[PDB]
Structures are given as C-alpha cells and as structure tokens.
Amino acid sequence: LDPVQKLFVDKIREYRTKRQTSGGPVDAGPEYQQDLDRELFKLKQMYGKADMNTFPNFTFEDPKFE
Amino acid sequence: RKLALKTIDWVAFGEIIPRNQKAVANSLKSWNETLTSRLATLPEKPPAIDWAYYKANVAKAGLVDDFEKKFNALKVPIPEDKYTAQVDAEEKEDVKSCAEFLTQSKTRIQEYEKELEKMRN
C-alpha cells in the first residue's frame, strides 16, 4: 500500500547511508566480521589452499636420457 | 592422438621381441596399453571462461581484471622429448634386421636351393 510505502522509503534511505560509509557493517558490529571468518576458513579447503587473489604459477617436466 | 599404427603393431608387437631388448618389450607392451587408454579418455582442452558475466558481476573488478590480463597474456610451452633417438636407432636396428640378416641368409638359402636340385634324386 501507500501508507506501507511510507515504511519502504525508510529502509531505502538506510541502505545508501551505510553503503557510502560502514561501521563494521552499519548495524552489525564486529559480530558480522567474526562470523565471516568462521565461514571463510572452511571455504579455502573447498576452493583450494592458496593463490585466491594471485595467479597460479606452474612448473614443467623432465625425462631420462636413454 | 599421439600414437598411431605404423606397420601391423599392437598385436604384432608383443609377440616379438629382439633378444637385445627381448625381455624389456614384454613389460613395455603392457605399459603402453595403460598410456593408450588413458590418453584417449582425458579431456583435450577445457572451456575458456565467460569473462562478461564474471567481470561485470564480480565487482572487485580491480583484482579480477588485473588477474584477467595476467591470464590472457599467460603463455604455455610443450612437454619434452627424452627417448626418440630410439626412433632413430630404429633405422639402425632396421639395417640389422634386413641387410645384416637379409644378406647373409639370402646367401645361405642360395646353397640350400642349389643342393635341392640333385636331391630330387
């Protein structure tokens, strides 16, 4: 409704204020950040072990002279 | 892909093993078959990433785009020979085989046949 779009406005306002700022997450404090870190570790194992932000190097192979 | 038949070979191979490698070939045959079936299976090349979706919608695009450039520039070599003057010791072994046996044996057979004439009787 339109008296219920009066509430919808309210939320839209808070979203921008946060996004162009942050306090933790604006409304979240350390608590968010801490939770992430618990999920973030387990995902490394699911996703590999390193190179997550940096291109993988490679190596090349050899033989036996016969 | 990598191999082929030359002559008559995977069957015609295994049975026949020049004494100077003879023993080796028995073991080598079975190794080869392992390589054969394996190679045929593998993928040959993957896809090559849809950048459009990832660049737009992974909006850390400073990171993504830099890694992109490094990947797109990224050059690749080939594997390594090691064992292919065997290929050429082949033409040598092929001399040994024909002329070195061909010739001496042809002269031998020459005598066996000339002696065949009289022993018709």
Swiss-Prot record, chain A:
One term under GO cellular component: proton-transporting ATP synthase complex
Modification sites for N6-succinyllysine: 49, 64
N6-acetyllysine: residues carrying this PTM: 6, 11, 44, 49, 64
Keyword Glycosyltransferase: no
GO molecular function: proton transmembrane transporter activity
Compartments, record wording: Mitochondrion; Mitochondrion inner membrane
Keyword annotations: Acetylation, CF(0), Hydrogen ion transport, Ion transport, Membrane, Mitochondrion, Mitochondrion inner membrane, Phosphoprotein, Transit peptide, Transport
Keyword Mitochondrion: yes
GO biological process, one term: proton motive force-driven ATP synthesis
Cysteines engaged in disulfide bonds, as pairs: none
Superkingdom, taxonomy of origin: Eukaryota
Subunit structure: Component of the ATP synthase complex composed at least of ATP5F1A/subunit alpha, ATP5F1B/subunit beta, ATP5MC1/subunit c (homooctomer), MT-ATP6/subunit a, MT-ATP8/subunit 8, ATP5ME/subunit e, ATP5MF/subunit f, ATP5MG/subunit g, ATP5MK/subunit k, ATP5MJ/subunit j, ATP5F1C/subunit gamma, ATP5F1D/subunit delta, ATP5F1E/subunit epsilon, ATP5PF/subunit F6, ATP5PB/subunit b, ATP5PD/subunit d, ATP5PO/subunit OSCP.
Annotated family: Belongs to the eukaryotic ATPase subunit F6 family.
Role according to the record: Subunit F6, of the mitochondrial membrane ATP synthase complex (F(1)F(0) ATP synthase or Complex V) that produces ATP from ADP in the presence of a proton gradient across the membrane which is generated by electron transport complexes of the respiratory chain. ATP synthase complex consist of a soluble F(1) head domain - the catalytic core - and a membrane F(1) domain - the membrane proton channel. These two domains are linked by a central stalk rotating inside the F(1) region and a stationary peripheral stalk.
Annotated protein name in UniProt: ATP synthase peripheral stalk subunit F6, mitochondrial
Provenance organism: Bos taurus
Organism lineage string: Eukaryota, Metazoa, Chordata, Craniata, Vertebrata
Gene transcribed to yield this protein: ATP5PF
Portion held of the full protein: 36 to 101 of 108
UniProtKB/Swiss-Prot annotation, chain B:
Subunit-level organization: Component of the ATP synthase complex composed at least of ATP5F1A/subunit alpha, ATP5F1B/subunit beta, ATP5MC1/subunit c (homooctomer), MT-ATP6/subunit a, MT-ATP8/subunit 8, ATP5ME/subunit e, ATP5MF/subunit f, ATP5MG/subunit g, ATP5MK/subunit k, ATP5MJ/subunit j, ATP5F1C/subunit gamma, ATP5F1D/subunit delta, ATP5F1E/subunit epsilon, ATP5PF/subunit F6, ATP5PB/subunit b, ATP5PD/subunit d, ATP5PO/subunit OSCP.
Positions spanned in the full protein: 4 to 124 of 161
Superkingdom in the source lineage: Eukaryota
Protein's cellular compartments: Mitochondrion; Mitochondrion inner membrane
Keyword Cell membrane recorded: no
GO biological processes: proton motive force-driven ATP synthesis; proton motive force-driven mitochondrial ATP synthesis
Known role: Subunit d, of the mitochondrial membrane ATP synthase complex (F(1)F(0) ATP synthase or Complex V) that produces ATP from ADP in the presence of a proton gradient across the membrane which is generated by electron transport complexes of the respiratory chain. ATP synthase complex consist of a soluble F(1) head domain - the catalytic core - and a membrane F(1) domain - the membrane proton channel. These two domains are linked by a central stalk rotating inside the F(1) region and a stationary peripheral stalk.
Entry's Gene Ontology cellular component terms: mitochondrial inner membrane; mitochondrion; proton-transporting ATP synthase complex
Residues modified as N6-succinyllysine: 75, 82, 92
Modified residues (N6-acetyllysine): 29, 45, 60, 69, 75, 82, 92, 114
Name recorded for this polypeptide: ATP synthase peripheral stalk subunit d, mitochondrial
UniProt entry tagged with the keyword Membrane: yes
Family as reported in the entry's similarity comment: Belongs to the ATPase d subunit family.
